[PDB]
Amino acid sequence: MQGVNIYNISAGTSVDLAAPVTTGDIVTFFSSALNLNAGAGNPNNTTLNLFAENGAYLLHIAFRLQENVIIFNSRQPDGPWLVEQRVSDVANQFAGIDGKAMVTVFDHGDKYQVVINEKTVIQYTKQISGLTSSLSYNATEETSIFSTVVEAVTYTGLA
Amino acid sequence: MQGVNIYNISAGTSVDLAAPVTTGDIVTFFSSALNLNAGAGNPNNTTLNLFAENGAYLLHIAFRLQENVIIFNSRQPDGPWLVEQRVSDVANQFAGIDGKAMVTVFDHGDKYQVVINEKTVIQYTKQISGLTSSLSYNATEETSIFSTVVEAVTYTGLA
Ligand SMILES: CC(=O)N[C@H]1[C@H](O[C@@H]2[C@H](O[C@]3(C(=O)O)C[C@H](O)[C@@H](NC(C)=O)[C@H]([C@H](O)[C@H](O)CO)O3)[C@@H](O)[C@H](O[C@H]3[C@H](O)[C@@H](O)[C@H](O)O[C@@H]3CO)O[C@@H]2CO)O[C@H](CO)[C@H](O)[C@@H]1O[C@@H]1O[C@H](CO)[C@H](O)[C@H](O)[C@H]1O
Numbered sequence: 096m097q098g099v100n101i102y103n104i105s106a107g108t109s110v111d112l113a114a115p116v117t118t119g120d121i122v123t124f125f126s127s128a129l130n131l132n133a134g135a136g137n138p139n140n141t142t143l144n145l146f147a148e149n150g151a152y153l154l155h156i157a158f159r160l161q162e163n164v165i166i167f168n169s170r171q172p173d174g175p176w177l178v179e180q181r182v183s184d185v186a187n188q189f190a191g192i193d194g195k196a197m198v199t200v201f202d203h204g205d206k207y208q209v210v211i212n213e214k215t216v217i218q219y220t221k222q223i224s225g226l227t228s229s230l231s232y233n234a235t236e237e238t239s240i241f242s243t244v245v246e247a248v249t250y251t252g253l254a
Numbered sequence: 255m256q257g258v259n260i261y262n263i264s265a266g267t268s269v270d271l272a273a274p275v276t277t278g279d280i281v282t283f284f285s286s287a288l289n290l291n292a293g294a295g296n297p298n299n300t301t302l303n304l305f306a307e308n309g310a311y312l313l314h315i316a317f318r319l320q321e322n323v324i325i326f327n328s329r330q331p332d333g334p335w336l337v338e339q340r341v342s343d344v345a346n347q348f349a350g351i352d353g354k355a356m357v358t359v360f361d362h363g364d365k366y367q368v369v370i371n372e373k374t375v376i377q378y379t380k381q382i383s384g385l386t387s388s389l390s391y392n393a394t395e396e397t398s399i400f401s402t403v404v405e406a407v408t409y410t411g412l413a
Pocket residue numbers: 137138139155157166168176179
């Protein structure tokens with residue numbers, strides 16, 4: 096049955112989904128703030144993650160202002176990071192809207208489509224497959240580009 | 255293709271969609287406020303609408319505090335209001351979240367599934383079919399249960 100679930104992710108924490116995200120489902124992260132002038136990351140300023148049942152990082156979205164790039168990657172929980180995909184000009188991806196932002200991920204089965212507000216910044220070919228059982232938003236209190244609490248909304252049972 | 259579109263609807267206005275919403279698509283209205291003590295409507299306090307290309311109300315969602323009900327209906331532009339589907343106890347539907355709210359509409363072709371926050375309030379069997387080409391949020395700045403501006407986010411091209 097189609098459903099909507101809402102989660103409040105505080106910076107530096109994760110949440111387990113009550114309804115898993117699989118092929119055809121959607122997850123949108125909402126930030127009630129946007130600080131594109133934050134200091135240097137360590138190396139990341141902000142990261143958004145979708146975890147599989149087995150603990151794998153299905154999709155890792157990392158925003159690095161200092162390197163002016165958004166990174167997309169995957170990795171096993173006990174393995175190394177795999178092949179990174181990069182999008183240049185972080186600030187430009189959020190152009191049009193200020194004071195807040197929205198990041199959407201579509202699980203298309205063999206790929207993850209990431210959209211910043213209304214702009215699809217990448218069709219990321221999966222390096223690791225499976226359904227998402229957990230999410231996390233990692234960042235410090237001083238250098239995150241998003242608010243202290245990031246809200247995640249999932250639309251599941253779509254297919 | 256799958257896409258995300260954002261619209262800011264000021265009370266009493268409507269917007270034409272850049273991407274029409276059809277079977278398998280989703281639209282969520284976000285309110286940055288929630289006043290269940292707004293007072294008696296005239297008769298409605300707030301309405302959210304999905305219009306067909308010809309102006310027909312495909313889905314009319316009316317929040318009526320004085321009657322303590324949420325009304326769902328449809329009608330042709332020159333026709334009478336059709337059969338109302340009433341959900342009682344407005345406060346219960348928004349329970350769990352204060353200060354704001356979100357109303358989601360799933361277009362399943364034969365029905366419109368409406369979800370307030372995480373709670374599915376109705377599986378509205380359509381009385382009129384067709385694609386949604388426009389949306390509206392109607393209310394006065396005096397008695398609306400939502401903020402002056404409501405943001406509509408559509409997820410289209412899903413099917
Ligand atoms: C800290 C950092 O920026 N890490 C990113 C890394 O950048 C490389 C250097 O970092 C190390 C690391 O700690 O991972 C340094 C280690 O000594 C290296 N290990 C070994 C055995 O040599 C690793 C290793 O080379 C990579 O992991 C291989 O992929 O890299 C980083 O210090 C260096 O920074 C430059 C800087 O850009 C330049 O301006 C300055 O003048 O010199 C500095 C030092 O040379 O750049 C290195 C090359 O990139 O690069 C990897 C990708 O290759 C990652 O981006 C890594 O960050 C992780 O990325 C993950 C997602 O892919 C995830 O976001 C993690 O949270 C990140 O830490």
